[PDB]
Design a protein around this ligand. Structure first.
Ligand code: K
Ligand code: K
Ligand code: K
Ligand code: K
Ligand code: K
Ligand code: K
Ligand code: MG
Ligand code: MG
Ligand code: MG
Ligand code: MG
Ligand code: MG
Ligand code: MG
Ligand code: MG
Ligand code: MG
Ligand code: MG
Ligand code: MG
Ligand code: MG
Ligand code: MG
Ligand code: MG
Ligand code: MG
Ligand code: MG
Ligand code: MG
Ligand code: MG
Ligand code: ZN
Ligand code: ZN
Lengths: 55, 103, 211, 64, 83
RNA sequence: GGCACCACCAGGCGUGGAGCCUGCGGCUUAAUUUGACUCAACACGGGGAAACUUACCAGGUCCAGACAUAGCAAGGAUUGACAGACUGAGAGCUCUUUCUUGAUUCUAUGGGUGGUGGUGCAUGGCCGUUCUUAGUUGGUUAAUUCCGUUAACGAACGAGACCUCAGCCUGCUAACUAGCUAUGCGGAGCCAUCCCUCCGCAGCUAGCUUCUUAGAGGGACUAUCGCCGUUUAGGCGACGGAAGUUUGAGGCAAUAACAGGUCUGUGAUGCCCUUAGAUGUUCUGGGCCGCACGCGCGCUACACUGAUGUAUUCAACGAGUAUAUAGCCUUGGCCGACAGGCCCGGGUAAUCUUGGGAAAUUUCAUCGUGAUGGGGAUAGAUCAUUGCAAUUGUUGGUCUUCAACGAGGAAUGCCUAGUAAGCGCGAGUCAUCAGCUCGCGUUGACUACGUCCCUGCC
C-alpha cells in the first residue's frame, strides 16, 4: 500500500496546507477576509482587488 | 401598498451608490409611495497592512490598504411589483442592490 | 449560503484580479487592454476590451464561447449566468497596456529597442496624450543591465492627480538573454466629456474668463 | 546495493495451465476454484497456495 | 501514465462535449470537480494531448486551462468511436 | 555659509548594569538550512518552525520522465494484491507464494520536466538608501518658497497645490440595524394616590434629530489690528474665531544613482548544475530551540507618588460561521475553587457577540522601609485544553519553590502637544502559542521656541 503512505500526513491545519491562490507559496500569506494571497502577490494585485492607499 | 420592502444597497464608491439611491428615492416619491431613506449605515473600513518590501531588507516600511464598503438601506411600504419595477433602472456597476420583503 | 458583505466585496475583487490575469495570459497577442465586469440581474456580463477583436472572437465566435464556458465552470457560475462580450478599445494610443504589449511584440520579433520605443512615443503623442514616457531595463546590448528612458511631453509624478491622469503599464519581454522590462506611462489630457481622459482639471490649473 | 524492483513472475500460458479439457470427451475440468465473489466472474481463478485459497482480483482467502 | 480506459474515455468524452477543460495545480485532489477522475490523471492526460497539439494550455493563478484544437476535434472523434 | 531632536542646546523618558524573551555571531551538532553585517544586518525575510512549513540531517517510497524513435509483447508489454517473512511502519517496499491485469506500460536513445539548487556581480519587477533633502549678493520661507539684484526672460518637473483621516456646523438631508424628548402603563421610593425622583415596557399615528451615523455643502484667507521688516516678500504680538504652528497627521512624491536587498514571493527570468539509487515528490523520525561566551531590539523590576485585598466605573480602533448534532465570534442557564465542561440559542452582522462592562486611575483597608506582603527568575507535584501527535516542558490553571535586581561604568537612542511617558484594548501571525509588529483609545507632562558646539547633509 503506497497510496495510504503518500500524502498520508493530515493537512487539516498548518502553514503547509494553505497556499497563495496566485503562486502557491506558503509564506507571508494574508488570510484576512478570505483573500488567500501572499504579501507580495497582494501588494501587486491590490489595485485590482480594490484596496486603495489613502494613508 | 401592502407589504414592507427593505432595499439594501452596498458599494465601494460613494458617488455611484448615492446617485443610485437618489434614483430609487426619486422613483419612490414619483409613484407616491412613502419612502424611509436613504439610511446610511456606518462605513466598513477593510484594512490590510503589509511590508512593502518583497524581502526582509531595508527600512521596514508599511503600506496600509483600505477598502471602504458603504451600505444604504431604503424602507418602502408596497407590493413586490412596484419594487421590482423601480429597481429595474440602470444600477451602476459596483452597486449591489438587494430587495427583501418584510411583513 | 449567507456570505458577509466584507467577504463578498473581497471575493469580487479577487475574481476581477484573477479573470484579468487569465485573460492577460490567454488573450495576450489579441491586444487585450482590460476587462469590465458587469453583474446584471440575469447574468454577469463580462466585457473584454482588445485591439484584435476578431482574434478573441475566433472563427464564428468559437474562442469567445470557449472562454465563456471556461469562466462559467472554473468560477462556478450558474449555466448561462455569464456572457463574455468583446468591445473595441477606442483609443489604443492612450492606453499604456496596449502600447506596452505592442512594444513587447515589437521587440520579441527583433526590432531595435531605440527604434520601437520612439515609435511607441510617436504613436502615443499623435494619439493625443499630454505626455508619454517609456523605460526599457535589462540586458539591452551588453551583459551589464542598464535602463533607457524615453520621455516626451509633460508628465506629473506626485500627488493624487497621478491616479487620475497617468495611465501606466509594466510588461516583461522574455528574450534569449533574459527578461526585459517595459514601463509605459501615458499622461492623459483633461477631457470635459470624460472619454479621452480625466474630467477633472489639474488642481493647479487656473482659468480666468476674459472681461 | 540498490533495492531491486519486484518483476512480474512470468509463467508461459497459465490459462492452458488452468483447465483440464482432456481424455477426449468434453470436460473443461477447472483445476482451481472460481472465486465466489459475485463481481469476480467464473473465469476468475482463486489461486491456491501451500495453505490458502486466494483470489487475485480481490482478497477472498481460505487456509487449510 | 497508466490511466484506465474508463478514466481516459471519461476525460476524452467531457473534452469533446465541451471543447475545454480546467484544473487546479493539485496533484492529490483525488477527484476532478467535473470528471470522476482525480486531478492528477486529468492534468497528465491533458499534458499528453498538448505535446501532441491536441489542445492549447494556459496556466494562470494555480489553475490549468486547456482548449481543444482542430486536431483535437479530429483525434477525439476518432478515439471516442463516434462523432 | 546654511539646514536638521534620525544633530546639539534646555530637558523628559530611556538603553547600556539585573532576570527573562527574542534576533545575530561564536561554539557544539547527524543537521543545529539559510539570506542580510555602519547609518542603509541583527522581534528583519511579515521568519511567533511540535508535524507541514523546511531549504538541513537519518532513512523509506513514488514518477507526477510529456513527446518522438527503436525494441519487448494478447503463446502477455505491463498492473494490483491475501497470507507469511522483511520492515520504524497495515510501504507487496522487498522476498516466498500465485493469483490477478491487459497494450494505458516496459527497456534504450534523444527530448523534456521539476528543483526554497548556484549565480541579485546576467536580469525583470519590487523594495531600501542617497533624500523627502530641495533639487532638476541679500532678506524671507517647510521649500530653487517668494521678494529683490540682474544678460536673462518665460516655462516645466519636483516643493506646495492635490487626496485621505481628524478638528467646527443646535444650518441642510435622514434614520424600527441610532438615539432624544414627551405621553401612557407598570415597579420602587416618599409613604399610600397625587406630586416629585429613579427605573422598565409600548406606541412605523408621539413628535424630533441635540446627542449617534453618513452625505452634501459651508467654514480660514493670516482675514482684521499694532509693531518690525527695503515698510516689499514676510515675521512677531493681539482681538475675534472651532481652528491662526501652510490647523494636526498622513498618502503621493523629481533628476541621477548604488554592481544596495530579493533567483528562499512569483507557472518573472538568462546561464550553469541535477534529473529515477533525483538537488523532483512524498512519508517516518530528528534539527532549525541545541550552550563556557560576545552583541542588538525588548519585557519585568528594583517599590509606600507602592504592593496586596475590597468598593467603584469611564474608551476607541477593529473581528467574527460550510450549520453539517457542530466549523467562527460567542450571549444566557447549569456543574465546577480554578482550569474547564455540559445544555438551550443569536449573529454572514449600527441588528448577536458588544452601550464592546479595558487598565492605569479612584476609594477604603492592610502592609511599614525590612530584598519586605518589592521582584518573580528557576524548580517540584498535579489537573485541564489545542492537536494526529505536547518529550526538548504548546498553552492555561492549583499548591509549593522564592534567584539576580536597592536605579545601573564608558557610551548611546527617541522625543517640541494631546507630544514624551504611563495604561490597557484590537488586528495580523494563528488548530494551539504575542514579551513582536501594525493600529486604537485612556491618563497626560517637563523643557525649547534657538544654534552650528558635536554629528551628518547641502
Ligand atoms: K538601563
Ligand atoms: K528589525
Ligand atoms: K534589483
Ligand atoms: K525575486
Ligand atoms: K535563476
Ligand atoms: K510569499
Ligand atoms: Mg505634495
Ligand atoms: Mg541633550
Ligand atoms: Mg540589560
Ligand atoms: Mg520540520
Ligand atoms: Mg519531514
Ligand atoms: Mg525539494
Ligand atoms: Mg522555483
Ligand atoms: Mg543589486
Ligand atoms: Mg447633528
Ligand atoms: Mg552585491
Ligand atoms: Mg530561527
Ligand atoms: Mg488596587
Ligand atoms: Mg520577598
Ligand atoms: Mg508580588
Ligand atoms: Mg511555536
Ligand atoms: Mg493574537
Ligand atoms: Mg545620533
Ligand atoms: Zn504569491
Ligand atoms: Zn475475487
Amino acid at each position: 500500500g503506497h497510496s495510504n503512505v503518500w500524502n498520508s500526513h493530515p493537512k487539516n491545519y498548518g502553514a503547509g496546507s494553505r497556499v497563495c491562490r496566485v503562486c502557491g507559496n506558503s509564506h507571508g500569506l494574508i488570510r484576512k477576509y478570505g483573500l488567500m494571497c501572499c504579501r507580495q502577490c497582494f501588494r501587486s494585485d491590490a489595485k485590482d482587488i480594490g484596496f486603495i492607499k489613502y494613508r | 401598498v401592502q407589504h414592507r420592502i427593505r432595499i439594501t444597497l452596498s458599494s465601494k464608491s460613494v458617488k455611484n451608490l448615492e446617485k443610485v439611491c437618489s434614483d430609487l428615492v426619486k422613483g419612490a416619491k414619483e409613484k407616491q409611495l412613502k419612502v424611509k431613506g436613504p439610511v446610511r449605515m456606518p462605513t466598513k473600513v477593510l484594512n490590510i497592512t503589509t511590508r512593502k518590501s518583497p524581502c526582509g531588507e531595508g527600512t521596514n516600511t508599511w503600506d496600509r490598504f483600505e477598502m471602504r464598503v458603504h451600505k444604504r438601506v431604503i424602507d418602502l411600504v408596497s407590493s413586490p411589483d412596484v419594487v421590482k419595477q423601480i429597481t429595474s433602472i440602470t444600477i451602476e456597476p459596483g452597486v449591489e442592490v438587494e430587495v427583501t420583503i418584510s411583513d | 449560503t449567507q456570505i458577509s458583505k466584507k467577504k463578498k466585496f473581497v471575493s469580487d475583487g479577487v475574481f476581477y484580479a484573477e479573470l484579468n490575469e487569465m485573460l492577460t495570459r490567454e488573450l495576450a497577442e489579441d491586444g487585450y487592454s482590460g476587462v469590465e465586469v458587469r453583474v446584471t440581474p440575469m447574468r454577469t456580463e463580462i466585457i473584454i476590451r482588445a485591439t484584435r477583436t476578431q482574434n478573441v472572437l475566433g472563427e464564428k465566435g468559437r474562442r469567445i464561447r470557449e472562454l465563456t464556458s471556461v469562466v462559467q465552470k472554473r468560477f462556478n457560475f450558474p449555466e448561462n449566468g455569464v456572457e463574455l462580450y468583446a468591445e473595441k478599445v477606442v483609443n489604443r494610443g492612450l492606453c499604456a497596456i496596449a502600447q506596452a504589449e505592442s512594444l513587447r511584440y515589437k521587440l520579441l520579433g527583433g526590432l531595435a529597442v531605440r527604434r520601437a520605443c520612439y515609435g511607441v512615443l510617436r504613436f502615443v503623442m499623435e494619439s493625443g496624450a499630454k505626455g508619454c514616457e517609456v523605460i526599457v531595463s535589462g540586458k539591452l546590448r551588453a551583459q551589464r543591465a542598464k535602463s533607457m528612458k524615453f520621455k516626451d511631453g509633460y508628465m506629473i509624478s506626485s500627488g493624487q492627480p497621478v491616479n487620475e491622469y497617468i495611465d501606466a503599464a509594466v510588461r516583461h519581454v522574455l528574450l534569449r538573454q533574459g527578461v526585459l522590462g517595459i514601463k509605459v506611462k501615458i499622461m492623459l489630457d483633461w477631457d470635459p466629456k470624460g472619454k479621452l481622459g480625466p474630467t477633472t482639471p489639474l488642481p493647479d490649473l487656473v482659468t480666468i474668463h476674459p472681461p | 546495493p540498490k533495492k531491486q524492483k519486484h518483476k512480474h513472475k512470468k509463467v508461459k500460458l497459465a490459462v492452458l495451465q488452468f483447465y483440464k479439457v482432456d481424455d477426449a470427451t468434453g470436460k473443461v475440468t477447472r483445476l482451481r476454484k472460481e472465486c465466489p465473489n459475485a463481481d469476480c466472474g467464473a473465469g476468475t481463478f482463486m489461486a491456491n497456495h501451500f495453505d490458502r485459497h486466494y483470489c487475485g482480483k480481490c482478497g477472498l482467502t481460505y487456509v487449510y | 501514465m497508466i490511466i484506465s480506459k474508463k478514466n481516459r474515455n471519461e476525460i476524452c468524452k467531457y473534452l469533446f462535449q465541451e471543447g475545454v477543460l480546467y484544473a487546479k495545480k493539485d496533484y492529490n485532489l483525488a477527484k476532478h470537480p467535473q470528471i470522476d477522475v482525480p486531478n492528477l490523471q486529468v492534468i497528465k492526460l491533458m499534458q499528453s494531448f498538448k505535446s501532441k497539439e491536441y489542445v492549447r494550455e494556459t496556466f494562470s493563478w494555480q489553475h490549468y486551462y486547456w482548449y481543444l484544437t482542430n486536431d483535437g476535434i479530429e483525434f477525439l472523434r476518432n478515439f471516442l468511436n463516434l462523432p
